[model samples]
Target chain A: SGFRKMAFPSGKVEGCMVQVTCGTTTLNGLWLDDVVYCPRHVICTSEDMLNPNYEDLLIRKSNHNFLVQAGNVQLRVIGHSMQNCVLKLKVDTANPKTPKYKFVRIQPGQTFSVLACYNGSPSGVYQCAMRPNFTIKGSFLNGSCGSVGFNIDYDCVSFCYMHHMELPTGVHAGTDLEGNFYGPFVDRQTAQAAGTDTTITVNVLAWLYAAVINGDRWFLNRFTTTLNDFNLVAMKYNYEPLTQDHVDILGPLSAQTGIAVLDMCASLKELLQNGMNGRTILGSALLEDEFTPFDVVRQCSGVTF
Target chain B: SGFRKMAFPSGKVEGCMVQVTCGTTTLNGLWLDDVVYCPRHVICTSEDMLNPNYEDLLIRKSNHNFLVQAGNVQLRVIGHSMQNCVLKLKVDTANPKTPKYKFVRIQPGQTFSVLACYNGSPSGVYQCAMRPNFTIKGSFLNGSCGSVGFNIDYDCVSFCYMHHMELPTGVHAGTDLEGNFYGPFVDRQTAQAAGTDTTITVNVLAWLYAAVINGDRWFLNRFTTTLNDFNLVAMKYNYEPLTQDHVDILGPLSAQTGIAVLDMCASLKELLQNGMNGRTILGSALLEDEFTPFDVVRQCSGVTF
Candidate 1:
């Protein structure tokens, strides 16, 4: 291909490098706001193309392009703004079940039953990418940056963009896409389980983005109004399908514990599965059920299963 | 007493009403930003005293004035800015024991001794108010709004301002200066302890304020890099003075629980008390040992005392 192929990092990186190995036979590097230059081969400059800091680093859509435009005329249908390309939180039906009853023993204390209800949960991250054909080295269309009048197989991004974090038994932590780690409480255990609690692998990055996004679609938003329940989910366990015995055990302990927060794991898992499905039925490996590795009475303090 | 007295709520209330019980003899009422009316005697108005959202609801300083100024100009040094009013987070030495070894029995399973540490807590709301002179209805200063040139007792705020939230045994919750409550996790036990677990009593609110303040000076700052260890303290307890046996116990249990967040209560208590002291020797009830009601081995699930 003798055309100019633009370059960018597969994911976000400080001072990122987009390795474009073109010699005299093809066009040289692109000018990302006027920086790189190599001689002998002609330079194909496209200024003001995209914000290097823009979140979407690997996608080409109605606005984004990774290659030189074929002609002056773009086959764009809508004059859209890539600035508004924000990820929307896919609505999840990962509803943990309603309240379930269980008996927990507080050591140096007594045995009591708890009628636990599920903690409300906003869905975690969901990601997807187009399945593209590789016969073409890059995309070609009548248009380059407007609403894609047509999307060719090569127009699809070359990098993997699907994300579904695993929070399983024996797994104590997870992080956001930001590369931050868990506190020692969860971290130490996570280490033992041979897992690093990360938002995701440090090298790869992405989540659907949309400018209209405000709440849960973005994991940055507070997960639930129940402030600090995320860890409570870590501390407790679930008993699905409420029972009368569990309810009776609650009152006596209620006088002592004085408050009840039923384990919402059962319901949470279900909701997560639905969210992973991407629909009532549609699902892929990227949208799979999240795990509650520690969500069991066995993990709870002295609560017999 | 022939002086113009001002009025404000003992505490903040939305659409707050300040009960001014003055008569025709003295000033009838004081206008808070020009919003009160009492005709017979007179209306003493003061506008722009404070931002209602300002955390320091009640206090007088070299700057904040609660009453009318005397003799237009008078004894004043270093004209200061009330615009900088802010409360610093009082440091506390409420450290629980260091890593303590205890046998915690996981129900429906095996038992093992754990080495737990205290969760590092940024000291909660710390409040203190001036003990003012009530004989005079309001404060008297040579100049107002600037640094207090001179001070008479009544110049201080009338409403009380001193806070140290109690996290006692049987009480499992607490809040910040804002009126908010805990998740069911800590709130349940807090209710049994006969406390609402408020940042402070709802109607009465005040915390020290400072403008140059940042980091932990305000409770709003994140307490630590450890993302979610606050609840882990709720989930576990401590053992003071590191021991060989406790260290050894950790190795065995480490593989299963895979966690080792030792309770830092002893260090935390010491730090809190020191912060509470306001110094090495200066002490006040406003700064006391915050309780770890659930910090012992007894309350743990199957962990024997």
Candidate 2:
């Protein structure tokens, strides 16, 4: 009722702020931080994120725009998320010239590479798996915000002591009631939205509402943020990766206190099918990109805690 | 030369100046503290030295009347340059009443346990594929002793360190430079006839010196010892575990250091072979007992004088 009195004077109201224009390089740099686009554009970053936001964007790398590359190049896919994702390379396996690769939930910060080899007619590929010795943060919205506290531990485990050290008795985001679906942003809105609260529950609900509204607005404005509505948001945005399904489910609970995730155990396996391009490799790549151990309880395995 | 002079005056030598007694309990707790022995009565000291100069003495708990109810057992076997001897456990399979078992090199205490299952139709036998986790100290009549240390780090990989802590460098028992026949041992006169050095070197030169003397009156002498020789004598006459032919051929180097054994990684798989008296599980419990990693390196692995 109070927010109804200020932000939205009527039952529904909307406004457009000034046009924030930037150079293609700047925009590309900013947006590319969210999804994989084209090759020459990748030169904008200080370091390559090593992520392919989408398949068509990655396929743009070959000089001829053809999947074919000279022989002697190899591709590797590493599986994380405590799930094994294997890739085989063969031209025409996907496109006539490029070798298609498949993997599921490649864990966070793990490396996957492919080397191509050939005299002329045929090619071969060798692959191996490795978990990252270190992890780095990704920039979202030109670094205004994203997952701020997440860091991979010395022992190849992702860690975030955020809520753990703060919020004496409650969680900062989505429902930790059951202690699942945790990672920086529970859903886009919860992290980005601003609001007022009559009670802790209403305060969190308002925050999530603002998060959703702003997330939707961000999507509508950012050409790269393909999500037009909350429903499309899951496949559109990956945000340290929390799915809509997870949000819809864990949202209400996160509004309560005394909910927290296991510090060590975190996992969630992305379901794989075919991405928009009807490309299984792309779907696999997306799964690989989104692969993380969402099940926090399992990662704390063998530990009594 | 001084020993030669001392021997001349001691030709009609008096009996050993000290005595050590044999008993069911460990000699370590005994207050007795010097070298002593009786050749005729076969007494060594108030401290129990393993090799008390007794004939046809079986250190075997089940054989000849020696019963060691103590679960902790140590064995040492001096080979006349053993080609190889296999230690066979005549374990009961059907009764399921046998105690836990281990086989190890007496010197430096590197050990490996035999998997025993006594409840099935047939009892089973397990081989030592790796060095044991326990540590050891060994000494011989020549005042030579060796020590091996073990530490278990994370990742199931074991790290070991061995130093000839108390022994003279390069002075090993059983082999010789010229290879001459030595004594089985005899009365003091006979032992003196062979030369004191020859008597002292008997345990080390057995196989290599088998060619030295052909015609001789040989008698394994009874004796007493000092604190040092007491420990060495205990090691000598205590249970002598014959290094299994297969395991021994790994060469003394591999036997002492576990580096080469890691190559057995394939055979050192995660499996449980079945048998009540015969079946066994070769998993963490077995490996944990045989190996430890480098966790102690920071604390003691780097210990140096």
Candidate 3:
């Protein structure tokens, strides 16, 4: 009852005194004794609001688009709300030939970080909005006007840090989270329906500590060694540099890590089958591949965090 | 030269006035106008030849027989040559059952080494002189001197070294001039007919040096390590302490020879065919027989030196 009495006092309603127009919506009147609001499209100036009748009149939210970046080809949707909402990320990128969607829950202030390596595309666009149980201002708009309609440029510079620094902790769009369906949004209203509050800390230092404890020089060496070697070969054969960023992110690791790294021991069974025996001759081409023991562990070891 | 005159003097005659009958040779009186001599058996002291009445006395050259040995079943005929003769090693030993005959040129003061691995018998006997050469000392008969017979004990210790050592340089009885064909005597005469010089060095040190230079710790270690291990098993399973001369003949090699040694590099061909590959599991019984890598190299590898 007081909600109506506060805006319009003593049964007196304000009338249209000044009119303004912006993007789409329009306001024909803005004069009011109390703080009266018009649509976001009204771009009012000092002259438009110079009437004495409109003491505290205001034009509403006008700009709905967000300016964001491709955070390592991953778009993080942070929910600033206290309640969680089902959320979907609608992506329109040049990379993913076809449009892609990712669905996840945005806990209050939590982020949804997903793989958005939209290849073969110049730029990617995304929208993170509520899917259900929410509204934005007067219109039943699903997306938070403050955080939706983001424009993402093609930037893989952050990819190196994102991939090598830390392990991901949040559910990606396609990830199965207790069988909850989340995203390729066909349209805006569709994804405003899905949603978080968990803050994602890019705990790069945590992994570095893990490396020190485990003496895991492999995590860093794998990158540097391969980069130098590959670039060397590329310069020789292909006449081009193989890597865009040759310098390692973490810099040179310490040599005195006290790691008791053993050369992988091969069993007799493997030795024989691999033609370490005199019976078989390995083709020269077979040994030419630039795969190392670390690659074997990474690709086939089936270890996970 | 007075060579002929020394054997046959001219005018001054010597005499032996005694009558002796031995092996159908009658020497009634021995006297000579030149150098008069009598049989070795005629015991005539200095004054006994004081009679000049007996003149032109002479005792003829008669017996020529030889003594010999199987040389520990190898039958090394050290020719104390009274005469040249063909030889045969008639082994009644279990190993070589046949009466093997070796026709050889037995030079005086040299030896003929031949295979006589006589097995399963008390002793191995061989006849150095041909069936007929000349008479025995006073018997005026050839061969078959009962008390003159010799014996050889069964010994295979040398056999191990002979088989394991590098190819021999000097010729054995069966070897050709190029030092080819040293073993498996088909017949005694067939082998003995093939000759050699009187030298066999038993160059065991050469192979030891080879083992060290090639880092062939396998040869010595295979023995010592197996001895301890097998003996442990023996004490548990068979209750027998197994050993025959644990002292390495070459002696504990110098701990530091300053020789650069290399580990054996093996290709797949060698490991698989050698049964080192577990895929080709060898039968336990097959390995029960005594066969060494030396035998394999000798038989295969197309090596002939």
Candidate 4:
């Protein structure tokens, strides 16, 4: 209703121009007549003008292009527009109690990137829709102006620093105790075919980390006992324990890998020796309740909760 | 260190009592021999005296017997003792950043129940240590008088109301989306032999309850759109779709089952149609961020953090 419609009956005349002399002022013409004045919805790009289907000049200048991509726990919003446009980012989770959103101003060619933490969430799948903020512009063209969205299935296991530190590439990073993949499950068909007692192995340190921070009794009992089958340890990291030699090598290698592993083992040992006393110390020191969101972001990155 | 050891020969002499005789007053009699003067540390009960283990009459008046059990998102601490024993419930979660504790005064035979949310956590396994709060008693005992803690693995999915709403008697309440059982996995050997593509079908509302209360995006994305074959839905509740007559009858039957299902479905539908509007309403209303432990207990019973 805003832009005037094209007047050409053939839809294309060599060119046309509107010259309006309103009393004291006169307006100039486009190509002085080489350009046809078509409606905003028309796709009359300069490139399409020379094609045999000039009558089908069906591109609009105000058209918009929105694209979404995700990786490394970040979302990227790219907009390719022919005119200034407002981009709105709408986000949702699998069972969102509420949706979250943000706005980005795009002047023709611009991209916006948002970190997952920006939305105050951890690992999990996410859905995002990016569309032109039509209300902001009053009237907008179609094409790229249409909404675009994508789904992101993320698991903290994928980015676990411990898994990174201990396991080899290509080894399953998120296997449960039964060797089943802890999942977004991919899809029903894939899950049905995944085959058998697969479950999360409950990595020792991960479990301890959750227990200490939360001051939870549910995990305390397990911390006291010696974790049998040290072989599971090797298997978790993709290092086979076929030989005592492999086991021996792994022990030394893990010790040297980093302080996290050493610190965890040291804590585990202390828990073994002192039991409740050790739990008290760890629990008191790592209290999740006392920590602010900032503190959690800084110190408790890999925690599942 | 507080309770002194009682002296006895052969560890236990029939009975003994400390008596003092002054010039003006005299103490009681030899019938005190009817009692057994015993030490602490040995397992002794009223029944033990008649048993051959009498020489081991190693029983102390201050001995404590402690046991821990968990379910319904609560930990029950049961202790048997002669004297009043102060039970200290210490709790922790992973990376808790600090410890939390509560003291329950137990006079002889008493059980203390601790709700997980009491310590400011939603779900996930918790570690707890129950010890004698000697400080409360001014002086307490030794030998089993110390801490006894345990671990509880809790997931809201394990106790989803849907599971409650569906399965009939004797059927496992917790099953995956595919109706496969969710489990403790028992051990590696058991999980490995369990064989082939064991998968969980995400229970719709239970998962929703968790994601909404926790504001977890990881689980939200899975909630929208198609939920695989509807047969999975019928199979979940023990209905078959072989005949249109069956389907027609079941629809009316479900409506009449009770108001809880209707209420739940009503809430879910409102949530679905309202989308982010629903989320915003619930998120703002429930406001997990602003909830107190009591509020969480009251409003978020089924939610797992």
Q: Identify the runs in model 4 with alpha carbons over 4 angstroms from their true place.
A: A1-204, A217-305, B1-305
True contacts kept of each: 0.00, 0.00, 0.00, 0.00
User: Please, what are the lDDT tens digits per residue for candidate 3 over residues B1-305?
Assistant: 00000000000101111122224332221111111112221222234334311112212222222111222232222221111111121222222211221212221211111111111111111112101111100110111111111111111011100110111221122222111223433211121222221211111222233234333333232122344554454344222232333123213223233321111111111221353323321111111111122221221121111
Clashes of each: 68, 67, 53, 76
For model 1 the local lDDT of residue B15 reads 13
Q: Please give the ranking of all candidate structures by lDDT, highest first, separated by commas.
A: 4, 3, 2, 1
Model 2 chain A: weakest 10-residue lDDT segment is A8-17
Q: lDDT of all predictions, in order shown?
A: 0.18, 0.19, 0.19, 0.21
Please tell me which predicted candidate would have the highest lDDT against the true structure: 4
Worst 10-residue lDDT window for candidate 3 chain B reads: B1-10
- Model 4, residue B88: displacement in angstroms? 38
How good is model 3 by TM-score? 0.14
**Whole-structure CA lDDT of model 1:** 0.18
Q: What is candidate 1's DockQ?
A: 0.01
lDDT of 1 by residue, B1-305 (tens): 00000111111110111122212112111122222211111112222221132323323233212222111211122222221121221112111211121111111011111100001111001111111110101111111111100111121221111111113221112112121222222212122333222111100100111100101122222223131343233223221232333334333322323323232222232333343232221111232111111111111111110
How would you encode candidate 2's per-residue C-alpha lDDT over A67-102 as one tens digit per residue?
222223322211111101111122222222211211
lDDT by residue (A1-102, candidate 4, tens digit) is 000000101001001112211122222111111111111112323343234242232232112221122211222222111221111222221211111221
Candidate 1 TM-score, true structure as reference: 0.15
Model 3 C-alpha lDDT per residue in residues A1-305, reported as the tens digit of each score: 00000000000111111222233332221112211112221233334433312222222321222111232343222211111121112222322211122223332111111111111111101112221211111111111111111111121111000010011211122112212223331111122322321111111112222234322332222112344454443333322232222122112212223221211011111221353323221111111111112212211112211
Cα lDDT tens digits, model 4, B41-152, are 1233434323324223323212122222121122222222221111122212121111122212221111111111111111111111111110110011111111111111
